Amino acid sequence: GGPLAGVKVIELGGIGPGPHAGMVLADLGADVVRVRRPGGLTMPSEDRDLLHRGKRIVDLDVPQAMLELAAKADVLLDCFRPGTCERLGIGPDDCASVNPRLIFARITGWGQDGPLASTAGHDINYLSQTGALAAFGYADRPPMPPLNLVADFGGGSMLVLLGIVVALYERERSGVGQVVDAAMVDGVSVLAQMMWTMKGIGSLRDQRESFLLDGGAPFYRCYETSDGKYMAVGAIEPQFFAALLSGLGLSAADVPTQLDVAGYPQMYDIFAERFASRTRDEWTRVFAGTDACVTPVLAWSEAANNDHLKARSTVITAHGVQQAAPAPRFSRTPAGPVRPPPAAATPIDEINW
Amino acid sequence: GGPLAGVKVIELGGIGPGPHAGMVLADLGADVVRVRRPGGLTMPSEDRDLLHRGKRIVDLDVPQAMLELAAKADVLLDCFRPGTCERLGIGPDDCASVNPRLIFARITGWGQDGPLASTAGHDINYLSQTGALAAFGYADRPPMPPLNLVADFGGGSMLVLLGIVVALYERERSGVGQVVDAAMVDGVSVLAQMMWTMKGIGSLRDQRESFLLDGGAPFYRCYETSDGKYMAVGAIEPQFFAALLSGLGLSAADVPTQLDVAGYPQMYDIFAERFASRTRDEWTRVFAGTDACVTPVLAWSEAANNDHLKARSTVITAHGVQQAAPAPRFSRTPAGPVRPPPAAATPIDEINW
């Protein structure tokens, strides 16, 4: 039942990255157990939060009697502000005494140390300091955050997840766990390495919509269709640019060359023109199966019924509602079928550890 | 020297997710070795690509004499289209024979199985199928991709990274490795779980700029300042919304209530008004240190010199140019200082395995 089967995990804070990491841990077979006060004002109801599926809720106001729990656990996922966790009985030091095999993970937007460390903030904020946000969106309108996928999960949840499974492989040889500091601002900055590479090389400019991946290239952006929908183009490689020009019913000689940056504004118009003369459906048909790198922008509802995502069963309907199947996928020790979120809190003495 | 010290890794494909994962592996102590044909047309020169720092390049056209290499290695990071890897000598099967301890990781946008599997595509494309892209940007203009941070790295590089370190912990007990299928469309969908949760709960609407994290809430977006800069606001919690309203010099009674969604359009104007009457600098001073969740949107250049990111040394200047320090951070087995990208390809018989 999952490659991470047998791993005892203790989830504390209940928001964004914290719980999302917990989820994956459970999805991969780990025995995850949330610890939170009963008067929880969580939204939605835990029993309806896909971020808690496969987990077990346990009332336990922090009464330091939990140090007794950690000692039996492998991982402790701290999700509170820095310090608060050690302000109470629990903490990297205390836990160390009760269990030196413990993996003290900590997901934060600012990290443990630093001036901003005490400051409160969210995904949009952490992205403001890294410079990633300032490289998003159209030139005129202010920067618009990609929901909270970049910092909270892409560079938050995944970061602490990486750190945990790594701190596991470590102690699984050093026989001793340690503290893992997962800072969102850190993760995002690493997710942006390619940009830094560019920045040093001189491939970046000052204004937005100038780079290759920020809309500055007509062959890598979105075009509205006749029926008010959208198509996503990413014809980067010259070979794929060919396909794009082909299915679009355009002769290479008609449209400027990829190299003719100066004529991009014109290429955009030619692309916008053609793309808006048909419906997403028709277009999807045309570029279908070709290496043109042209796909239809699907909505949540639309995606869950997508042929590909269905075949590979990425978005499945597990007892209840539509959701995302565990990932990545393992060949010999795959993830068992998805269990539902905790229908009701489990006692505490009915643990297992 | 890193928690992943001693891990033999073989990097094949050389684009986006593949090499970015390889980097982190090296950053964490792993012995990563890239294998690619000599006539490589890579951009930029490998010796100037931060995604290759701490790694070793090795000329080796695929001449199946590499199966002999895998057998000594722990991980094989396949980054080619599905099939191509097994179309040559190498492949999950063949490698299994020479080394059953091998971890055959595979990062793909569409994954191994599925109709689209053979189709070519990029970050913007993979995001179009999951439905995450259709939830990005302003309502009028088409969706604009957050560079390639979401799919390529946030749900690509990190996914295969997770899969690997997990497959390591697995075999590090089952004494047998396996195949890891990291599909970007898969990772992104898991990065979007929160959304799916919302989708089933009924918190999502059909149009954009309607949810809490997509700009539909004036207290969670960006505002242009007097000096044409931008400030990122994320005052979600009522307590923080207070601070926002305070430093902004507004009386609770002046601006509509968070609950008065119908008056959001108005709240937006009041926020845009005040925010645009001062410079990012001044504003940064005002909301500085307060839990208002109001920060300045910094550009790449500006971020590298940011006080916080400097203290925690997130963006450091390693021998040469500016880049992102390793992550996450470990307390007993931290990451050694960052080495530079391969100055020159290393032979092949000078390996170590």
Short mmCIF file of C-alpha atoms in Angstrom, two decimals, chain A:
data_model
loop_
_atom_site.label_atom_id
_atom_site.label_comp_id
_atom_site.label_asym_id
_atom_site.label_seq_id
_atom_site.Cartn_x
_atom_site.Cartn_y
_atom_site.Cartn_z
CA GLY A 1 0.00 0.00 0.00
CA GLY A 2 2.23 2.82 -1.25
CA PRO A 3 6.06 3.24 -1.18
CA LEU A 4 5.78 5.44 1.91
CA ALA A 5 3.81 2.79 3.82
CA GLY A 6 4.62 2.58 7.52
CA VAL A 7 5.63 6.21 7.85
CA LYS A 8 4.10 7.89 10.88
CA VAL A 9 3.26 11.54 10.14
CA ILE A 10 1.90 14.27 12.41
CA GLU A 11 0.24 17.20 10.67
CA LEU A 12 -0.25 20.36 12.80
CA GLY A 13 -1.09 23.68 11.13
CA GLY A 14 -4.09 23.53 8.83
CA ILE A 15 -3.70 25.75 5.82
CA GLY A 16 -2.46 25.47 2.28
CA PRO A 17 1.02 23.91 2.01
CA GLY A 18 0.90 22.12 5.35
CA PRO A 19 -2.19 19.98 4.68
CA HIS A 20 -1.51 19.62 0.96
CA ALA A 21 1.83 17.95 1.76
CA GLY A 22 0.08 15.78 4.29
CA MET A 23 -2.29 14.67 1.54
CA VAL A 24 0.43 13.46 -0.83
CA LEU A 25 2.12 11.68 2.07
CA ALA A 26 -1.17 9.80 2.67
CA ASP A 27 -1.66 9.25 -1.05
CA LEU A 28 1.69 7.52 -1.08
CA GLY A 29 0.78 5.18 1.80
CA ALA A 30 2.02 7.09 4.84
CA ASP A 31 0.01 6.99 8.05
CA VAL A 32 -0.86 10.67 8.33
CA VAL A 33 -2.60 12.01 11.44
CA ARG A 34 -3.80 15.59 11.87
CA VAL A 35 -3.64 17.15 15.32
CA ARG A 36 -5.87 20.18 15.93
CA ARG A 37 -8.12 21.88 18.49
CA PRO A 38 -11.78 20.79 18.44
CA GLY A 39 -13.25 24.26 17.99
CA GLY A 40 -11.59 24.34 14.59
CA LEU A 41 -13.06 26.99 12.34
CA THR A 42 -11.85 25.25 9.18
CA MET A 43 -13.51 25.77 5.78
CA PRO A 44 -14.68 23.50 4.36
CA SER A 45 -15.57 20.81 6.84
CA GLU A 46 -12.55 18.51 7.12
CA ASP A 47 -14.68 15.55 6.05
CA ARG A 48 -15.11 17.37 2.73
CA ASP A 49 -11.50 18.60 2.26
CA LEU A 50 -9.69 16.53 -0.43
CA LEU A 51 -6.48 17.75 1.19
CA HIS A 52 -7.23 15.45 4.06
CA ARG A 53 -8.23 12.24 2.29
CA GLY A 54 -6.61 9.12 3.76
CA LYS A 55 -5.74 11.01 6.93
CA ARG A 56 -7.07 10.85 10.47
CA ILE A 57 -8.15 13.84 12.49
CA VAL A 58 -7.47 13.95 16.24
CA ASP A 59 -8.73 16.56 18.68
CA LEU A 60 -5.84 17.77 20.81
CA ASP A 61 -5.47 21.35 21.99
CA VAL A 62 -1.86 22.30 22.66
CA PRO A 63 -1.69 20.31 27.01
CA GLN A 64 1.76 19.14 25.91
CA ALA A 65 0.76 15.46 26.07
CA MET A 66 1.63 15.31 22.34
CA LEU A 67 5.36 15.04 22.87
CA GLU A 68 4.34 11.52 23.85
CA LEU A 69 2.86 11.07 20.38
CA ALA A 70 5.79 12.42 18.35
CA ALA A 71 8.10 9.97 20.10
CA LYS A 72 6.28 7.17 18.31
CA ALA A 73 6.00 9.04 15.01
CA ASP A 74 8.54 9.35 12.19
CA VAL A 75 7.56 12.79 10.86
CA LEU A 76 6.13 15.96 12.46
CA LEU A 77 4.81 18.43 9.91
CA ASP A 78 4.89 21.87 11.59
CA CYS A 79 2.78 24.41 9.72
CA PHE A 80 2.55 27.20 12.32
CA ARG A 81 4.43 30.49 12.29
CA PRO A 82 8.11 30.17 13.32
CA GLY A 83 8.48 29.88 17.07
CA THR A 84 4.84 29.21 17.91
CA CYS A 85 5.56 25.51 17.62
CA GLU A 86 8.39 25.74 20.20
CA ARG A 87 6.51 28.33 22.23
CA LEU A 88 4.41 25.36 23.29
CA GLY A 89 5.68 22.05 24.62
CA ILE A 90 6.58 20.74 21.18
CA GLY A 91 9.67 21.91 19.31
CA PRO A 92 12.80 20.67 17.47
CA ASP A 93 14.70 20.44 20.76
CA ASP A 94 12.03 18.81 22.93
CA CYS A 95 11.08 16.29 20.25
CA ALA A 96 14.74 15.45 19.79
CA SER A 97 14.87 14.33 23.43
CA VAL A 98 11.83 12.09 23.11
CA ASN A 99 12.72 10.82 19.62
CA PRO A 100 16.03 11.36 17.77
CA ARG A 101 14.57 9.44 14.79
CA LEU A 102 12.02 12.21 14.23
CA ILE A 103 11.94 14.31 11.06
CA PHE A 104 10.94 17.85 12.06
CA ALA A 105 9.64 19.40 8.83
CA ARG A 106 8.58 23.07 8.69
CA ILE A 107 6.76 24.80 5.80
CA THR A 108 6.80 28.57 5.86
CA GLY A 109 6.51 31.39 3.38
CA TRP A 110 9.41 33.31 4.85
CA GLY A 111 11.28 30.48 6.50
CA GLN A 112 12.54 30.25 10.07
CA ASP A 113 15.29 32.89 10.13
CA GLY A 114 15.27 36.36 8.65
CA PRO A 115 13.48 39.69 9.33
CA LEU A 116 10.33 38.80 7.46
CA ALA A 117 10.17 35.42 9.27
CA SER A 118 7.75 36.80 11.87
CA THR A 119 5.67 38.67 9.30
CA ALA A 120 2.44 37.12 8.06
CA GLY A 121 1.79 36.59 4.36
CA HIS A 122 0.30 34.45 1.58
CA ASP A 123 1.23 32.98 -1.78
CA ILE A 124 0.88 36.23 -3.69
CA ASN A 125 3.22 37.85 -1.15
CA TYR A 126 6.07 35.29 -1.11
CA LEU A 127 6.05 35.57 -4.88
CA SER A 128 6.50 39.32 -4.62
CA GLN A 129 9.92 39.03 -2.97
CA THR A 130 11.40 36.43 -5.35
CA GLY A 131 10.85 38.47 -8.47
CA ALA A 132 8.76 35.72 -10.01
CA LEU A 133 5.53 37.64 -9.64
CA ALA A 134 6.91 40.77 -11.25
CA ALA A 135 7.48 38.67 -14.39
CA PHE A 136 3.86 37.60 -14.69
CA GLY A 137 0.96 38.92 -16.74
CA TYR A 138 0.44 41.60 -19.33
CA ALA A 139 2.62 44.72 -19.51
CA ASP A 140 -0.12 47.29 -18.81
CA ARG A 141 -2.24 45.58 -16.12
CA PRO A 142 -0.58 44.78 -12.78
CA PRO A 143 0.82 41.25 -12.14
CA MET A 144 -1.81 38.61 -11.53
CA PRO A 145 -0.91 35.55 -9.37
CA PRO A 146 -1.50 32.03 -10.78
CA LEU A 147 -3.93 31.22 -7.94
CA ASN A 148 -1.61 29.88 -5.27
CA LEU A 149 0.01 27.12 -7.25
CA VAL A 150 3.48 28.59 -7.50
CA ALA A 151 4.46 29.28 -3.89
CA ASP A 152 1.95 27.45 -1.70
CA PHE A 153 2.17 24.16 -3.57
CA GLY A 154 4.71 24.20 -6.42
CA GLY A 155 7.39 25.65 -4.20
CA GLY A 156 5.85 25.10 -0.78
CA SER A 157 4.08 21.76 -0.45
CA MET A 158 6.46 20.05 -2.91
CA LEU A 159 9.49 21.60 -1.18
CA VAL A 160 8.66 20.25 2.26
CA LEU A 161 7.58 17.03 0.62
CA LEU A 162 11.00 16.76 -1.03
CA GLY A 163 12.76 17.69 2.16
CA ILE A 164 10.77 15.07 4.12
CA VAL A 165 11.28 12.10 1.80
CA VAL A 166 14.89 13.22 1.61
CA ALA A 167 15.30 13.58 5.38
CA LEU A 168 13.82 10.05 5.44
CA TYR A 169 16.32 8.51 3.05
CA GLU A 170 18.97 10.30 5.15
CA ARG A 171 18.02 9.02 8.60
CA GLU A 172 17.28 5.70 6.88
CA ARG A 173 21.07 5.35 6.82
CA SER A 174 22.21 7.78 9.48
CA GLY A 175 19.63 6.35 11.86
CA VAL A 176 19.04 9.92 13.01
CA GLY A 177 16.47 12.42 11.83
CA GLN A 178 16.77 16.19 11.74
CA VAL A 179 15.00 19.49 11.05
CA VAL A 180 13.86 20.43 7.56
CA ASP A 181 13.27 24.13 6.84
CA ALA A 182 11.06 24.51 3.77
CA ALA A 183 10.77 28.20 2.89
CA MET A 184 8.34 29.06 0.12
CA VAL A 185 10.37 32.08 -0.93
CA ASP A 186 13.25 29.53 -1.19
CA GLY A 187 11.32 27.00 -3.27
CA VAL A 188 9.96 29.55 -5.67
CA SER A 189 13.47 30.97 -6.13
CA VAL A 190 14.67 27.48 -7.09
CA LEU A 191 11.67 27.00 -9.36
CA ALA A 192 12.93 30.13 -11.02
CA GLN A 193 16.56 29.02 -11.58
CA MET A 194 16.07 28.91 -15.36
CA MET A 195 15.22 32.59 -15.14
CA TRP A 196 18.32 33.36 -13.08
CA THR A 197 20.29 31.49 -15.69
CA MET A 198 18.74 33.81 -18.26
CA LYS A 199 19.25 36.88 -16.12
CA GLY A 200 23.01 36.31 -16.03
CA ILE A 201 23.18 35.41 -19.69
CA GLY A 202 21.37 38.54 -20.74
CA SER A 203 18.29 36.91 -22.28
CA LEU A 204 15.91 38.92 -20.08
CA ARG A 205 14.74 42.48 -20.61
CA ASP A 206 13.19 44.97 -18.25
CA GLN A 207 9.56 45.08 -19.41
CA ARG A 208 7.09 42.21 -19.42
CA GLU A 209 5.85 40.30 -22.47
CA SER A 210 9.43 40.39 -23.77
CA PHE A 211 10.90 36.95 -22.95
CA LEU A 212 10.08 33.64 -24.65
CA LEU A 213 7.86 32.26 -21.92
CA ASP A 214 6.04 35.38 -20.74
CA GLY A 215 3.88 36.19 -23.74
CA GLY A 216 6.59 38.11 -25.56
CA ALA A 217 6.45 35.51 -28.30
CA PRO A 218 3.27 35.03 -30.36
CA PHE A 219 4.12 31.35 -30.82
CA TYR A 220 3.89 30.77 -27.05
CA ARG A 221 0.67 32.23 -25.60
CA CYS A 222 -3.12 32.04 -25.82
CA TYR A 223 -5.50 33.06 -28.61
CA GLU A 224 -9.26 33.61 -28.30
CA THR A 225 -11.44 31.59 -30.65
CA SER A 226 -14.67 32.49 -32.44
CA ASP A 227 -16.87 30.98 -29.73
CA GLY A 228 -15.20 33.07 -27.02
CA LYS A 229 -12.99 30.15 -25.90
CA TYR A 230 -9.22 29.95 -25.90
CA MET A 231 -6.49 27.85 -27.48
CA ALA A 232 -3.01 27.43 -26.01
CA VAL A 233 -0.06 27.59 -28.40
CA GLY A 234 3.47 26.63 -27.52
CA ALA A 235 5.07 26.06 -30.88
CA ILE A 236 8.62 26.82 -29.75
CA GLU A 237 10.85 24.48 -31.72
CA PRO A 238 11.05 25.47 -35.41
CA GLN A 239 9.62 22.06 -36.45
CA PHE A 240 6.57 22.61 -34.25
CA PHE A 241 6.27 26.22 -35.47
CA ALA A 242 5.86 24.65 -38.91
CA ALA A 243 2.93 22.55 -37.79
CA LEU A 244 1.42 25.64 -36.17
CA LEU A 245 1.68 27.59 -39.39
CA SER A 246 0.41 24.59 -41.36
CA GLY A 247 -2.78 23.69 -39.51
CA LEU A 248 -3.42 27.40 -39.15
CA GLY A 249 -3.67 27.55 -42.92
CA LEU A 250 -0.72 29.93 -43.30
CA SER A 251 2.26 29.79 -45.68
CA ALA A 252 5.69 30.23 -44.14
CA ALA A 253 6.18 33.13 -46.59
CA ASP A 254 2.99 34.78 -45.28
CA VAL A 255 3.97 35.01 -41.63
CA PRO A 256 7.18 36.56 -40.31
CA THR A 257 10.00 34.22 -39.19
CA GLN A 258 10.55 33.12 -35.60
CA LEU A 259 13.83 34.96 -35.82
CA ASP A 260 12.18 38.21 -37.00
CA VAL A 261 11.43 39.41 -33.47
CA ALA A 262 10.84 42.91 -34.81
CA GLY A 263 7.88 41.56 -36.72
CA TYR A 264 6.39 39.67 -33.77
CA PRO A 265 3.67 42.27 -33.23
CA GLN A 266 2.61 41.50 -36.81
CA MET A 267 2.87 37.71 -36.36
CA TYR A 268 0.56 38.10 -33.34
CA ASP A 269 -2.10 39.78 -35.44
CA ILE A 270 -1.86 37.09 -38.14
CA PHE A 271 -2.15 34.43 -35.44
CA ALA A 272 -4.98 36.24 -33.61
CA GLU A 273 -6.80 36.73 -36.90
CA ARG A 274 -6.81 33.08 -37.97
CA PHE A 275 -7.37 31.65 -34.47
CA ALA A 276 -10.48 33.79 -33.90
CA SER A 277 -12.10 32.70 -37.19
CA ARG A 278 -13.05 29.29 -35.81
CA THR A 279 -14.32 27.58 -32.65
CA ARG A 280 -12.11 25.89 -30.08
CA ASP A 281 -13.69 22.62 -31.13
CA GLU A 282 -12.86 22.95 -34.82
CA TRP A 283 -9.33 24.12 -33.95
CA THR A 284 -8.81 21.25 -31.51
CA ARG A 285 -9.72 18.93 -34.41
CA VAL A 286 -7.29 20.55 -36.83
CA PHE A 287 -4.17 20.54 -34.63
CA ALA A 288 -5.31 17.27 -33.09
CA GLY A 289 -2.56 14.67 -32.83
CA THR A 290 -0.03 16.92 -34.62
CA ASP A 291 3.20 18.12 -32.97
CA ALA A 292 1.98 21.68 -33.46
CA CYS A 293 1.82 22.16 -29.69
CA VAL A 294 -1.69 23.59 -29.98
CA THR A 295 -4.24 22.49 -27.43
CA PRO A 296 -7.61 23.73 -26.15
CA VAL A 297 -7.66 25.57 -22.85
CA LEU A 298 -10.06 23.43 -20.81
CA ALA A 299 -11.99 24.48 -17.75
CA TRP A 300 -12.08 22.47 -14.53
CA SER A 301 -15.41 20.91 -15.53
CA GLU A 302 -14.05 20.30 -19.04
CA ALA A 303 -10.77 18.82 -17.85
CA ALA A 304 -12.34 16.18 -15.62
CA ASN A 305 -13.98 14.71 -18.75
CA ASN A 306 -10.91 15.10 -20.99
CA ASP A 307 -10.06 11.98 -22.96
CA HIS A 308 -6.39 11.91 -22.07
CA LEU A 309 -6.73 12.83 -18.38
CA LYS A 310 -9.42 10.12 -18.17
CA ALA A 311 -7.45 7.36 -19.89
CA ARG A 312 -4.45 7.93 -17.58
CA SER A 313 -7.04 8.50 -14.86
CA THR A 314 -5.44 11.72 -13.62
CA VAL A 315 -8.71 13.34 -12.59
CA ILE A 316 -10.89 10.60 -11.18
CA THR A 317 -14.25 10.57 -9.41
CA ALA A 318 -13.54 8.86 -6.09
CA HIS A 319 -16.42 8.01 -3.76
CA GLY A 320 -18.01 11.43 -3.69
CA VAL A 321 -16.59 14.12 -5.93
CA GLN A 322 -14.07 14.76 -8.74
CA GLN A 323 -10.44 15.00 -7.69
CA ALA A 324 -6.79 14.37 -8.61
CA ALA A 325 -5.28 10.86 -8.52
CA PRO A 326 -2.10 10.36 -6.45
CA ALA A 327 1.26 11.16 -8.09
CA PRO A 328 3.80 10.39 -9.28
CA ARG A 329 3.13 6.80 -10.34
CA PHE A 330 5.20 3.83 -9.17
CA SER A 331 5.47 0.53 -11.07
CA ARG A 332 6.00 -1.98 -8.27
CA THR A 333 4.61 -0.13 -5.22
CA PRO A 334 1.85 2.10 -6.65
CA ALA A 335 -0.54 4.14 -4.55
CA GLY A 336 -3.60 2.30 -3.35
CA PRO A 337 -7.07 3.59 -4.31
CA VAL A 338 -7.97 6.97 -2.85
CA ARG A 339 -9.67 6.91 0.51
CA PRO A 340 -12.08 9.67 1.57
CA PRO A 341 -11.36 12.47 4.04
CA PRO A 342 -11.92 11.73 7.76
CA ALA A 343 -15.66 11.25 8.19
CA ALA A 344 -15.21 11.79 11.94
CA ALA A 345 -12.26 12.36 14.28
CA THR A 346 -10.60 9.19 15.58
CA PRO A 347 -10.11 9.00 19.40
CA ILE A 348 -6.41 9.12 20.22
CA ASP A 349 -5.71 5.92 22.07
CA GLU A 350 -6.90 4.02 19.02
CA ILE A 351 -3.73 5.15 17.21
CA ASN A 352 -1.35 2.33 16.22
CA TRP A 353 1.98 3.82 17.26
#
